[PDB]
Every structure is written in C-alpha cells, then in structure tokens.
Amino acid sequence: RGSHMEDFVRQCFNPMIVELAEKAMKEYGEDPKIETNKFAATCTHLEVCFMYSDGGSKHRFEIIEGRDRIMAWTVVNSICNTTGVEKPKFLPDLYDYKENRFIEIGVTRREVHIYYLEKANKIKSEKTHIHIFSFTGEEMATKADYTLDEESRARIKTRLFTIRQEMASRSLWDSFRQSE
Amino acid sequence: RGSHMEDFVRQCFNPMIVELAEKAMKEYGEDPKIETNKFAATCTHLEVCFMYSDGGSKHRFEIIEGRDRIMAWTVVNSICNTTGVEKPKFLPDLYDYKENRFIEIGVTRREVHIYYLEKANKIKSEKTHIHIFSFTGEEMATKADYTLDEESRARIKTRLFTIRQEMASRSLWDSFRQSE
Amino acid sequence: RGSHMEDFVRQCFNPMIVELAEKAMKEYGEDPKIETNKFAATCTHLEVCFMYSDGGSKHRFEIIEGRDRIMAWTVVNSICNTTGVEKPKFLPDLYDYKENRFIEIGVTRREVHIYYLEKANKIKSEKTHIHIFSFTGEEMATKADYTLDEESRARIKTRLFTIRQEMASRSLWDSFRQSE
Amino acid sequence: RGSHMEDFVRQCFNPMIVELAEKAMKEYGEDPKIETNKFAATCTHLEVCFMYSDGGSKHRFEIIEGRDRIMAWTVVNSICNTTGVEKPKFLPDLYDYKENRFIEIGVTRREVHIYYLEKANKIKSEKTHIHIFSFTGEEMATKADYTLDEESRARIKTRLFTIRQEMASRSLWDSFRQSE
Amino acid sequence: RGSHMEDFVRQCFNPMIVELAEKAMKEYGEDPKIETNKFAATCTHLEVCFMYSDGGSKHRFEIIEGRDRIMAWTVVNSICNTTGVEKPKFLPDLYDYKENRFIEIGVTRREVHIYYLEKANKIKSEKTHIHIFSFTGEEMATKADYTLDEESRARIKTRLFTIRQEMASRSLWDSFRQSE
Amino acid sequence: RGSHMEDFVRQCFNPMIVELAEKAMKEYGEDPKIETNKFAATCTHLEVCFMYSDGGSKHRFEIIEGRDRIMAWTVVNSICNTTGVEKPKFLPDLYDYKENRFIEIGVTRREVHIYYLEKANKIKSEKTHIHIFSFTGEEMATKADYTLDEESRARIKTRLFTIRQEMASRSLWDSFRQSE
Amino acid sequence: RGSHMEDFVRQCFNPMIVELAEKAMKEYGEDPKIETNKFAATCTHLEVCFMYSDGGSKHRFEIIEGRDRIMAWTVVNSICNTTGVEKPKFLPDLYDYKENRFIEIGVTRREVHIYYLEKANKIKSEKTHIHIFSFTGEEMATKADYTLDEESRARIKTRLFTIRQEMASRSLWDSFRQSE
Amino acid sequence: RGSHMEDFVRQCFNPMIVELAEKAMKEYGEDPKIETNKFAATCTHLEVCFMYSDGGSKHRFEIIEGRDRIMAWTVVNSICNTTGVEKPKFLPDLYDYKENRFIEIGVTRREVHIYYLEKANKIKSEKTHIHIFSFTGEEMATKADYTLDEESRARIKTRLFTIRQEMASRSLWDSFRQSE
Ligand SMILES: [Mn+2]
Ligand SMILES: [Mn+2]
Ligand SMILES: [Mn+2]
Ligand SMILES: [Mn+2]
Ligand SMILES: [Mn+2]
Ligand SMILES: [Mn+2]
Ligand SMILES: [Mn+2]
Ligand SMILES: [Mn+2]
Ligand SMILES: [Mn+2]
Ligand SMILES: [Mn+2]
Ligand SMILES: [Mn+2]
Ligand SMILES: [Mn+2]
Ligand SMILES: [Mn+2]
Ligand SMILES: [Mn+2]
C-alpha cells in the first residue's frame, strides 16, 4: 500500500494505541494498511477513551474499549453481576463506578447532533450514558451530564483539534472528513 | 501433578502475588502443586488485601498479610505499642491508621453470613474489624462500616466475579466451589 | 569558547532542560557556547515554566514553552479553536484550563515592575495573564491573581535564589546581572 | 571491626539512606564501622526526616537534612531570602512551606521531655519548630502543633518501634539505648 | 473455550513469543483459543528459530520467521537483491550470512525422516537449507551440514524434550502428538 | 510542510538517529521538514556508519559522524596526536584502531564508481580510507580493502535495499533517486 | 533468632542468591534463621555454581542447581534423553555441553582430598565429573580435568577467600569452620 | 569555592567516577572543591583504570582502585592467598589473572620516563607491573610488556588527549600541568 495516512497514524499516536487499534481491526476483519481512515479513527477513539478514564479520580472508570471482545465482555458481566445493572446489548467503552453506568464514547466528523442520534438509536437501552466528541470542538452528553470536569474535557477537544491540524497540514484531512 | 488449576492460577494472578502465595503455603506446610484450590484461594485473598489497601488515602493502611509470620507479627507489636490497641490473638490482614483498628479480610464461596459468623467466632476479640467479600458479589462488614468507598469495594467485587468466570470457562469453578 | 558559565549551566540544570534550551537558541540563531548568559536565562525560564505547570492540579496547564515553534503554535490554535479564546499575537508559555487564559512567564534581573511593563506593552492583547518572577524573590501577576498556591510560588523563588547563589559563588552573577 | 550493628544497619535501612548517613558521618569525622550506634542513629533520624516530608501535600516540605552542609545551607539562605524568615543559627532538618517555619526533628532514646529541652536550649531562636519522636512511641512538638496528620505520625512511630524490636531481637538494643 | 493447553502455552513460553504466535495465527485465520495444539506448535517453532539465530556469531543470521508476511518478504527481496540468491517460492525462517543460504526450520512429532521428505518436496528449490528437529531428540539437516555447533543444537533438543515432559506431566502430550 | 517523506523517515529510522540527523542538518542550516530527501539521506548515512562501527571487534572503531562539529574535530586531534596520523582536511566518519586510518563512508544512489571518484577528489589526502555503499547492493573500497567481514557488509546492503523498497512502496523512491 | 551470621549472609551475597538459598533450605525443611552456617554454605555453593557457568563460552553449561527439585530433575531427563548420558542417581549442579558430562560442585572447609572422597563415594556412577573448591584456595577435579580456564577458577578462589576474611573479621569464621 | 575546574570535572567525567573520586579524596582528607587539580587527576586516573580493565578478555582483571581501602586490601589478600603472589607494600590498581601480577597505573603530566622512575622507586618490590600513560600520548610499561592490545591502549591515549584539549579550551590546562 504505502499510504501517507498509515505512516502519519504511526507517527501521531502512541505505539501501545497503534498496536491496540491494529489488533482491534484485524479481529473484525479490517486491514489498517488498506483502510487507513478507519485506522486513524480507531486510534483517535482509543486515545479519547484513555484520556477519559484518566479524568477524575483513580479507579473511577473501568476501561472496556481496547480489550479483546471475549475479555471485554467478561468484565461487563462482572460489573453487571456486581452492581445489578442491565447487560448492554452492544459493547460499551467504559463503566463509571461513581455514577454506576456504562459510557459509550463517540468521535464524529459531522455535527455532534447527528452522531448522538445514530448512537442513541442503536443503543435502545437508554441506561448506557452517551458522550460524543467532535474534531472541531463540540461535545454532547446524555441529560447534559458530561461526567468529567470541564478541564479534562477541554484537554480532549484540544488534542482532537491538533489531530485535525496535523492531518490537514499533510493534505489528508479532507479524505478523513469525507470518510465517515 | 500437572493440574489445570495450577496453570490457571499462574496465568490469572500477578507474579508477585503467586510468589507470595507460594511462600505462604510452603511456610505452613502446603503444596501449591497438589492442593491447587487453596493455591487459588490464597492468591485471591492476597489480591483482595492489596486492592483494599490501595483504596482510600496513601499510607492509610498497614499491610500485614503477605509478610512472613515473624515479621508480620513484628509490625503488629509496633502498631499496638504505638497506638495502644490490644494485641490480636490471630494474625490479621491490615491495620487502619484512619479508624485505628485491624481488619480481617475474608473471601468466601458460600453466603457472606456464614463466613462472617465463623470469622467472628475465632476472633473472640471484638476489636478487630471484619470485612467479608463473596465471589457472587456481596459483602458484610462489622457494624455495617465498610471502611472504603463504594467505588473501591465495587472494583474488588468485579474482579472477584471475573475470577469465577475464568474458572467456570475452564470447567474448574465447581471444584473450587465445593472446595471450601 | 570554554566559558565557566556554560559548564555551570550544564551542571546546574537538568539535562532535558539544557537540551530544550539548546534546541531553542539554535532555532532562533543563538549560540549557547558563545552567549552563555542567554543560555542560563533560557534554562532558568524553562525550569520556572515546568515547575509552574507542576503546581496545582494534574492536566491543569498546557505547556507551550519548550516545544518547537510550529508545534507550539499548533497547540495554541487547538486551544483557541476549542475554548473560543482570542489567538495571541506572540507565543505564550502556558495555558490555564482552570482559568481559561494563557500565561506569559517572566524571570527578571531588575525589579519586577519594569519587566512587567515591557511585557504588558508587547502583549497589547490584555487577555494573556502575566506572571513575573525575580531572582531576589519578588513576583508580580496580573490583577494580583497569582494563579498557583503560595507554597508552589515559594518553591520557585527559593530555586531562583539558589541559582543566584550558585552563580555568585563562582563569580559569574555580576556578568549575568548586567546581561539583561 | 566486624560489628553486628553495622551489618544490621545495612540490612535494616534503605541503601540510599545508608549512603547518605555514611557521607554525613565521614564529613563530620565519624567512622560508621567503629561508632555503629551513631551510624544507626543517623540512619534512623534520616529515615524519619524522609517520611516526615512524605507526609502531607507534595512540595509542602523542603528537605534540608541529607544534603552536604554547604548546599544544605545554600537552600536555607534561599528560603530565608524568599520568605523573610530569620536565618537559623544551627542547621535545621526541613522547612514547611505551608506553615512558613523550619522544623528540627529529633529521635530520642529517653523520654521526649528531656530531648526537647536540650533541643530548645541550643535553638535559642524560638522560631524553628521542634518535633521529637521516641522509639517507645511518644512525640512532643512545639505549641502542641504536630504539623502532620495523625496517620502520618503514627506510621513513623510504628517504624521506630520495629527498629527497636529488630535490634533487641539481635541483642543490640541495650547497647544502642545506653549509647545516647 | 478454556483449554488446559492454552493456559499451558502461556505459562510455558515467553510472552513475546506467545504474542508473535498469536499474531501469526490470526493473520492466517487461526484461533489460538480453539486450535491450541497449533498454538503450541507455533510457539515451539518460533522459540526454536530464535535459539537457532542465537547460536553462532552475532549478526550471522537474519530472522525471517516472526515478522508479518509483507515485511518478512521485504527482507527476503533485500537479501536476494544483495547476495544474488534465488528468491524462494515459500517463506523461509532464517538466512545465513556465513553460508549464504536460507534455512527452513522444522519441529516434528514423528521421525525426522518423514518431515524432511515433506519439507524437501514442497521446497522444490534445493537451494534452501533444511534443518529438522524432533521432540524426542533427533535432527536431520541437508547434506549432513547442521550449520551450528553441537552445543547450540544440543540446547535446542534439551528444551524440546522439556516441553514434551511438561505436556505429558499435564496429560496433554498425547493430544499434541496425534495432532500432527 | 506535511511531506510523506518526513513521516516515513520518522517511522523508518531509530529515534536517536532521527534526532542526530535533525541536529546535524539544523547545525548546517538545513530544514528536515522542507528538504526531506536530505533528511532521509542523513539518517541513512548515519545508520550505515553505526552498523559499520558495530562490525568487527569492540572498541575497534571511533565514531566521528554524529557528534557536533567542534567535538567531532576534538576527537580527530586526539587520534592524530596519539597515533601520529596526518590531520584530515575534511571531517571523516570513523577511525580504525586496527588499521590505523580514518574511514569516509558514502551511500550513493548512482553507480559506486562515480561517487568514489567525487569522494577521492575532495579527499586529496589519500591516507583516509574510502568505503562506498549503494542502495542496489554494491560497494567499492580503497585498495579493495573492505575492512569488515563479508557478513557485516552484507547486513548493511540488505538494510539499504529494504529502505529503497519501503520508499518505492510509498511512491517516494523516484524523488529520492533523482535527488542526488 | 537475631544471629550475626544471618545478617552477614544477607549483606554479603546477592539478593537473588539469598532468595534461592532460602527457597532451597525451606524446601528441604531447613531454617535459614536458625541454622545460619548452612545458610552461608548454601549461598556460597550457589554463587560458586553461578560463576562456574559464567566461565567459558555462552550456553556452554546448563544450570541445574538453584532450580526447584522437580524442574531441576526435568532438565536432567531432557539432557539425558537428548545426549544419551546415563541418569545420575543424585541431583548434580551443572551440565557441560562441551564435554558432555554433568558436574558436581563442592565447597569444603577441610582439605579438598577428604571432601572429594566423600563426594565420589556417594556418586558411585563415575560418569559425573567432580570439581571441589576450598576456602583457603585449593581445587581438585576428576582426572585433573578442571574444565574451565585458570583465570575463571582463580576468580572463584579469590571470592572464596574474601568470604572467609569477611567472616573472620566479624569473628564468625571459627563457628563456620567447625560447622562442616 | 566556585572553581571552573570543579564544574568541568563534573561535566567531563561520568557521575559514578566523580562519586568514587570524591569518596577517595575525602577518605584521605582531601577536598575536591578546594584542590580541584587533584580532583581532576583522581577522576582521570580512575577512568584510565576502568578502561584498562575493560580491555582484553572478560574477568581478566580484578579492579582494586576505586574500592575503599579496607575492602581494596581484602581483595589483595584473597588474590595473594589464592595465587601465591607476594603481598604488595602499597595498594596497587588492578590484578592480571592472565599474567598473574598486579598492575600499578600512572597518568603523568611530564615525560613518562620520570614518572615511572618515581613509581619504581616506591615500589621496591619489582613484582608489581607498572604501566604509565601520558596526556600527550606516550606510554611506558615494565619490560616493554604493555599487557593489552595496541587498540585498547590507543583508546586510552585518545581520551587522555581529549581531556587536555577540553581543559586548554577553558584555559585550565596550564594550572593542571604545573600542578603535578
Ligand atoms: Mn467501543
Ligand atoms: Mn465508542
Ligand atoms: Mn491473613
Ligand atoms: Mn483474611
Ligand atoms: Mn515563551
Ligand atoms: Mn516567558
Ligand atoms: Mn539535622
Ligand atoms: Mn534533627
Ligand atoms: Mn519452519
Ligand atoms: Mn561524515
Ligand atoms: Mn560519509
Ligand atoms: Mn547441588
Ligand atoms: Mn554441589
Ligand atoms: Mn595508579
């Protein structure tokens, strides 16, 4: 292949995040060397999930995203069978021990209103909290409850905009924008 | 021997916890390669003790479990001769500098009501606080005082249920359940 | 060259700070081996910026100083396009996520009143917060808002005075004082 | 020499503490291999000073003990010339940025009342705060202001009593007790 | 699944070897949790390849096995376009810079005579050197040229027999033997 | 800028080599973000120099390339004033303690015959040994004395061809080829 | 207990050697805190075995001493079933891949002639090579074949005499001498 | 003090060498901050001793210089009581296990002929081998036996001349030259 986006993803993101994104796509039958926009999206969504759990108190969140599917589910059963929360239909991203709810994290390239709508439709179980992030710098969360501090959310939006600038500086943003 | 449970314990728990459990059983004349259910129980009880001390503030707890008996006692004398607390008859697991009491941690495979009863009977000295944990996800603590935050206790129950799932997934839970 | 001040700067400051100061001066066409007083000033200003961000909460500050100009700007655009703050004319040193403002850090060898005046004149955009530090041990901040705790600011002034003592002990302070 | 106390000190205390105590005694013309009770006392006093600064908030204390005399003084001048505190006649152990005072730490083998008296007599400058610790488990601080939390002070007394037990277990406590 | 062989493979082999074997099987559409005998065979073949390159001089061998297919081929082209050796039809395991030939490593569960025959049939290009190893402790190499020292080959056979003993001790060898 | 070649250089070469190449170009007034082909050439020439010194015995070579000019010269004077070798007019790359001569390493994109000619013309002092390497896989050394083993030189040519394949796979080789 | 010899053993020998000796004695029902002379002898014999394998070429020796009995035997079976050597009746210390024989290492406090005699009597199988070392500085090996270089054996005797001096300097050698 | 030479010594030599030289001078009642030329000479002599032992085979040399006097002697007794070599009157620097002799290393600022003469006069025991090194680049060894390879000795002279250049570049060589 030899795509500019693949080499940018490896230079932009942390090696442990690239490896986890590579393992995730291959597990679902995706090629990071061919479909490089999904490779960039998976790394971005992964890093956002990690910074999110880094916000707030220690051991406040349980990280579901990034684990292989079987083990990622195994933790979901344990959290449900411990706290008494309904089992989600689809795999979520985190669990909040402080608010006792799962969190589905989204990173969109359009307006946050559309992405949340498509997310809340698939998640017919209204118990899982939703928190969308946008590259331009918006965010929409369920019941206007954004969970973390303003400063922790601000760090995420700042990094999101840096990625967009880095892509556009290499003339790869427009392909990534029209990808979603 | 070559038991499935021994290889699972080594793959499931952290190497430092396995070594401490191995040293503990051998010191009391127990074979981790033969009696593998007690090997799994000692690792589980050890990890629960470590997460427990990881809850709350730093240097809030003094870890007694995991040390060799002579040194584990030596610290008990120092804590007693410093705070003026009665010397426990049997070796406890932790000491709470915030609540000024020793803690005996239990991890049971039956209902928490029975295990606490047997624990409180041996500990005729009602000064040592008792905190039981169950694999299914319950907990019973003395005077309904559970010491740590709800989130820290929730992390322990979640990990406890993951261990049960991992055992049952390998068809070793029933032997571990009827072991106690 | 073989200047006493160059070898003192390398012995006084942390290697990562010396490398960042070396990279900064060379990027702006400055020689650390020739103009060693500016070499000492850049290291001092860098270390003060790092301790400043180390004060307060984690992820409270975004460190702009120390990055290469293109990337240092890139983060400024992201912070502006995320929080809605006006773009500064000149490169600042940090950004406060808690107070939503950029910070320009100064380390002067004269009275803090003059240095602040020259700083506020160049920064015609009154939105960027200014915080001056002096070697003797004073500080002047915009609107008397010194941002960090008294203890964190005290640590900075103490280190500043240690550097002056170390220079004067080697008979290099007077050259550094009349340098500015 | 080949003293039991020297090998106990090396086995009991952390290597960085032993090296700092060795460097301290040699600087003052003392032999750790000959006068092993002073070797044990210097290590104990050093470790108590380190745990003390580990109590409370980060960067709350400035550690004076453990540095070589010239640099230990250099920091004292900087703290005085920054906060406006009188220069102590004798070298103190720490400085409290929160309470704006120097701390002299003592570890005695008799009752804390005597040791404090001898300490307050030498320190005719009543500005430096005094905090005595005893092996048996007492403490006396100036104006009954013990600075740190009860839990942090309790950790120090517990460790102090463990050292006494370790010495007595090797029949070296009586020599250490009649040493002071 | 929860197979005894999967947990044995993770406990028996080095983590970097397990990860490389996991990545290899998934790339070829194989499940290490389901087909655990091939999981053990891939780890064994990988470790044998690594010890083989560890024999002899440094930089004597170029390791082809363990790399992802595209990069593993890329190195083959470079070695061919540098030394002038014919391009192998199938991916080999190593390249010998000292003897200027590729090496195909085999680890069989039957007699080495059969495995070599099947290997030499697929490798119709007689230029690639073949070196078979057996669990019981035999070896067959092309033209009786075993490349490495007797001591380095002996270390490989010893480790091979230890793996067989470890499997048989857990009653998993017969399934692994009848697997091939 | 945002060039594909810059991100490839950072992904292809080791971080310490990229930093040394960056420092080298900036010192000579070159921009690695603009003139990315020279950025790739400097990294390649650096890595070839490092592998070259890695060949043969330990401490056989003194690495001149990679150091800043003033210190790189300083070592040249020491080697000359120690062994009695004439001072080279231009900065060489290594020094051979075994053959008592400096080595100038070249990595060309045309035939090795031309590059050596231009190299030997500038180096009018015929004492400095010359060793050219080509991407396609040739090498020309002074007096047919190639210094290192055949296997060590083969490793260099193999890596050289891998870089060419990686560039061509990303459609950046032709620009790099017509660069020289 | 609190013995001078126990604290000397911990200060004299490497932590990994002390842990292996502790695990060895406990496995055979021995107390390192009570029988401290056997604790010193096991550490000494262990360190001698490790330096012995460090002599000569890499991977020349297979270390049997230091492993737990079951695994130490497992390797013996593999070495026998690979090289065709008779199975030793008692556990040896090393295996020589170069000379194809097991080695029994001895460290005596009397003359090497007696210790070898008692060793060769128990080892009725004359195939296992014997190599005795003495604290004073002698050595006796089977068939006058001392296996390693003179320099490697000299390093062992030098360290052996340093241990004797360290013990005698603490007035513990005579108890260790009359122990055997 | 604040001497240019002290800060140069700390910047020129490795931290472990500076610490060992500091400990050596203080042990003999010397101040590295006052007598900085002896501080530079001790570091230089130490580094030369370390490179010397780094020459040749592994474990060929026993390093005596750098240890504290009591332990440095202890090893000398062990080497003598093991190999049967006469005890040196003064402390040597190394011991050669290959040539069975102690080595006294010298680093002079005058001609090597004088320094060797003064060295051989004090060492009336003609058994200890002598090897002098000069800053300008000469060497004189007993019986013209220079022990190590030409390349290893050349590395030492090259580093020696680099130190002289670094001193002269800072106008501190003349003081160091007239120091001896
Ligand atoms: Mn997800
Ligand atoms: Mn998501
Ligand atoms: Mn317990
Ligand atoms: Mn318990
Ligand atoms: Mn700035
Ligand atoms: Mn500034
Ligand atoms: Mn003090
Ligand atoms: Mn004190
Ligand atoms: Mn193969
Ligand atoms: Mn060059
Ligand atoms: Mn070159
Ligand atoms: Mn043995
Ligand atoms: Mn033995
Ligand atoms: Mn000397």
Task: Give me ligand 12 centre to Cα G55, in Å.
Answer: 18
* G4 Cα to chain B: minimum distance (Å): 18
Gyration radius of chain G's alpha carbons: 16
The secondary structure element, H or E, covering residue A94 is strand A94-96
| Chains adjacent to C (≥3 CB pairs closer than 8 angstroms) | A, D, F, H
| Chains adjacent to F (≥3 CB pairs closer than 8 angstroms) | A, C, E, H
* Rounded CA separation D105/D46 (Å): 9
C93 is in an annotated binding site: yes
Chain H residues touching D33 at Cβ < 8 A: 70
Residue list, annotated binding site of A: 45, 65, 93, 104-105
Residue with tokens 């480790």: E159
At C28, is the secondary structure helix, strand, or coil? coil
The secondary structure element, H or E, covering residue G63 is strand G61-63
* F13 Cα to chain E: minimum distance (Å): 15
* Rounded CA separation F28/F43 (Å): 15
| Per-residue tokens: G36 | 């401290």
Residues forming beta bridges with residue F62, ordered by sequence position: F95
Concatenating the DSSP letter of every residue in G23-48 gives HHHHHTT--TTT-HHHHHHHHHHHHH
Residue B83 near chain A (CB below 8 Å): no
Strand E101-108, strand G61-63: pairing: unpaired
Catalytic residues of C: 119
Give the residue from B103, B152, B155, B161 showing the smallest Cα distance to B134: B161
DSSP state of H65: T
* Rounded CA separation G30/H127 (Å): 48
The residues in C 130-159 lying below 8 A from A, measured between CB atoms, are: none
Amino acid, single-letter form, for residue F5? M
* Rounded CA separation D44/D25 (Å): 13
Residue C165 near chain D (CB below 8 Å): yes
Nearest CA in chain C to F27: C26
Residues forming beta bridges with residue D131, ordered by sequence position: D105, D141
| Per-residue tokens: F15 | 């971080």
The torsion of the CA quartet F117, F123, F127, F131, rounded to 10 degrees, works out to: -50
DSSP state of H177: H
| Per-residue tokens: H23 | 């400990």
* Rounded CA separation F5/F171 (Å): 10
Chains B and H touch (3+ CB pairs under 8 A): no
Task: Give me ligand 12 centre to Cα G92, in Å.
Answer: 5
Strand H101-108, strand H129-134: pairing: parallel
G147 neighbors G103 (Cβ within 8 angstroms): yes
Amino acid, single-letter form, for residue B2? G
Residue H83 near chain G (CB below 8 Å): yes
CB-facing half-sphere around the CA of C143: CA atoms within 13 A: 7
* Rounded CA separation E18/B11 (Å): 13
The secondary structure element, H or E, covering residue D95 is strand D94-96
Helices assigned H by DSSP within chain E: 4-12, 15-27, 36-54, 69-83, 112-122, 150-169, 173-177
| Per-residue tokens: E73 | 């081929």
* Rounded CA separation C13/C36 (Å): 13
* Rounded CA separation E50/E44 (Å): 10
* D1 Cα to chain G: minimum distance (Å): 7
* Rounded CA separation E108/D164 (Å): 63
* Rounded CA separation G156/G162 (Å): 10
Angle (nearest 5°) at CA A148 between A147 and A153:
120
* Rounded CA separation G46/G31 (Å): 17
Residues forming beta bridges with residue A104, ordered by sequence position: A130
The secondary structure element, H or E, covering residue B52 is helix B36-54
| Per-residue tokens: C129 | 């917060």
Give the residue from H65, H29, H44, H46 showing the smallest Cα distance to H177: H44
Amino acid, single-letter form, for residue H1? R
Chain C residues touching A155 at Cβ < 8 A: 59, 62, 97
C59 is in an annotated binding site: no
E113 neighbors E140 (Cβ within 8 angstroms): yes
* Rounded CA separation D26/G148 (Å): 43
Task: Tell me whether residue E30 is exposed, middle or buried, using C-beta atoms within 10 angstroms of its C-beta: 0 to 12, 13 to 18, 19 or more.
Answer: middle
| Per-residue tokens: A4 | 């500019």
Residue list, annotated binding site of E for Mn(2+): 45, 65, 93, 104-105
Residue H170 near chain F (CB below 8 Å): no
* Rounded CA separation E56/G126 (Å): 32
* Rounded CA separation H27/E72 (Å): 59
Residue G79 near chain E (CB below 8 Å): yes
* Rounded CA separation H157/H137 (Å): 5
At C43, is the secondary structure helix, strand, or coil? helix
Report residues near ion ligand 5: CB below 5 Å: C 65, 93
Contact F161 E83 (CB under 8 A): no
* C99 Cα to chain A: minimum distance (Å): 9
Its sign, for the CA torsion B30, B31, B34, B37, is positive
* Rounded CA separation C115/C136 (Å): 14
Task: Give me ligand 13 centre to Cα G122, in Å.
Answer: 12
F135 neighbors F111 (Cβ within 8 angstroms): no
* Rounded CA separation B72/B85 (Å): 16
> Could you tell me the resolution of this structure in angstroms?
2.3
Residue C7 CA from chain centroid, whole number: 21
At D132, is the secondary structure helix, strand, or coil? strand
Helices assigned H by DSSP within H14-86: 15-27, 36-54, 69-83
Residue list, annotated binding site of G: 45, 65, 93, 104-105
Residue H33 near chain C (CB below 8 Å): no
At A92, is the secondary structure helix, strand, or coil? coil
Amino acid, single-letter form, for residue E51? M
Chains H and E touch (3+ CB pairs under 8 A): no
Concatenating the DSSP letter of every residue in chain F gives ---HHHHHHHHHS-HHHHHHHHHHHHHTT--TTT-HHHHHHHHHHHHHHHHHHHSSSTT-EEE-TTS-HHHHHHHHHHHHHHH-PPPPSS--SEEETTTTEEEEEEEESS-HHHHHHHHHHH--STTSEEEEEESSS-EEEGGG---S-HHHHHHHHHHHHHHHHHHHHTT-HHHHHTT-
Give the residue from G135, G141, G18, G23 showing the smallest Cα distance to G72: G23
Residue D7 near chain G (CB below 8 Å): yes
Q: Which residues contact A95 (CB under 8 A, 6 or more apart)?
A: A61, A62, A64, A76, A79, A101, A102, A103
| Per-residue tokens: B39 | 């090997």
Give the residue from F120, F159, F152 showing the smallest Cα distance to F137: F159
Chains H and F touch (3+ CB pairs under 8 A): yes
* Rounded CA separation C115/C121 (Å): 10
* Rounded CA separation D102/F18 (Å): 49
Catalytic residues of A: 119
